[PDB]
Amino acid sequence: SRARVYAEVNSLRSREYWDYEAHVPSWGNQDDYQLVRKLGRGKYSEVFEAINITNNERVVVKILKKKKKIKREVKILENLRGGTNIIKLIDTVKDPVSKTPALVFEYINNTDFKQLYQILTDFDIRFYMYELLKALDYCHSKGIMHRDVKPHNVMIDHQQKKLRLIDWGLAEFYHPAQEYNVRVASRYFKGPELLVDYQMYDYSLDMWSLGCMLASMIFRREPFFHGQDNYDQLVRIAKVLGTEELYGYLKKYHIDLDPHFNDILGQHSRKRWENFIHSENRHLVSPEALDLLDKLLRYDHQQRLTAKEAMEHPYFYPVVK
Ligand SMILES: C=Cc1cc(O)cc2nc(-c3ccc(O)c(F)c3)oc12
Structure with missing residues (x-):
């Protein structure tokens, strides 16, 4: 088929x-984001309404629960960014304490x-x-x-x-x-x-x-x-x-x-x-x-x-x- x-x-x-396995995200510092309200959860992440504390922009922060799967999501979002009615990925960040990867999106x-x-x-x-x-x-x-x-x-x-x-x-x-x-x-x-x-x-x-x-x-x-x-x-x-x-x-x-x-x-x-x-x-x-x-x-x-x-x-x- x-x-x-x-x-x-x-x-x-x-x-x-x-070739998303070859993609190398740059993981910035999630300490730029205040996660003010839990929006929702699922088997793969938890999602928060957040503020970027440097410029006061409202965003969503999705904390992810293998690296290959993360790379796939990130590469796809980058490929699709700008597309009509595709959620816009803003950044890829890690909490400095937990080191857990997280994606920042438009709100x-x-x-x-x-x-x-x-x-x-x-x-x-x-x-x-x-x-x-x-x-x-x-x-x-x-x-x-x-x-x-x-x-x-x-x-x-x-x-x-x-x-x-x-x-x-x-x-x-x-x-x-x-x-x-x-x-x-x-x-x-x-x-x-x-x-x-x-x-x-x-x-x-x-x-x-x-x-x-x-x-x-x-x-x-x-x-x-x-x-x-x-x-x-x-x-x-x-x-x-x-x-x-x-x-x-x-x-x-x-x-x-x-x-x-x-x-x-x-x-x-x-x-x-x-x-x-x-x-x-x-x-x-x-x-x-x-x-x-x-x-x-x-x-x-x-x-x-x-x-x-x-x-x-x-x-x-x-x-x-
Ligand atoms: C969960 C409720 C929810 C509510 C809301 O006002 C905005 C949201 N944005 C997301 C979101 C964006 C990108 C994702 O990849 C994702 F998994 C969730 O979830 C949202």
Whole structure:
């Protein structure tokens, strides 16, 4: 399998661009930063609102929990810096006591998605999805898969109508035919490819995750596919997309399906997306929304819209207007 777009991006650039193991960060002194408020945590870092005490600028400081992984994140952020709606890396620093590496970013005043998604209009969803597509078309065009697209990693300042895609710690360079670790994304946003241990995935993985976000936004079921574990996640998907459709996918790409799935997958017809409309979400759903969604949440990673293709869809006509 190969990416339909941006397949040869990395091979056509200087080795320096993508050889992140060769990258040498310069680690400055974190004592220039006062970490005033804890914002959030995860398996890979803790994040603080901070002030640069030399010039009084507001920033975020992300304290990281192997060097190779740090180098990857840093090189990717540098490669992407300046890109539309990519979080801007400002510095790479270490606390002089702890010596622990930390990344300094621009500060966005985020509106927590649980509160926000409840009050978005149809137009707002189109608007923010368009902005997130700008970030994804950009990073894909730069040979990079995010591989952790989810509401938590999409910062929105609703007042300033600003969006940043954050947490590039699972991002990787795309190289044709390379086999990638499937232990990426967060469960509810994992593409089928990850759930069946298919390693030759590409940028299309991010478009599945984006589709999951779009379904949760227009239908108000968040998350949309709520699996209890990695096995059940695929069952949840198959109850919507259908089982015969899944087997077709597995056959085409010669994927070995874990034998345990035969006990739990069942027999499910493909469900029409109209099945998810009810009186509480009707005002966020349109034929255009459902047409787009159907073209993102596809088992076959090759057939999912690219970021650029998605941006040309009628769903986004109002936003471009
Ligand atoms: C955690 C909440 C949070 C809240 C907020 O107002 C701004 C933030 N910026 C980040 C952030 C930026 C870059 C990263 O790589 C990262 F992991 C997090 O997280 C933020």
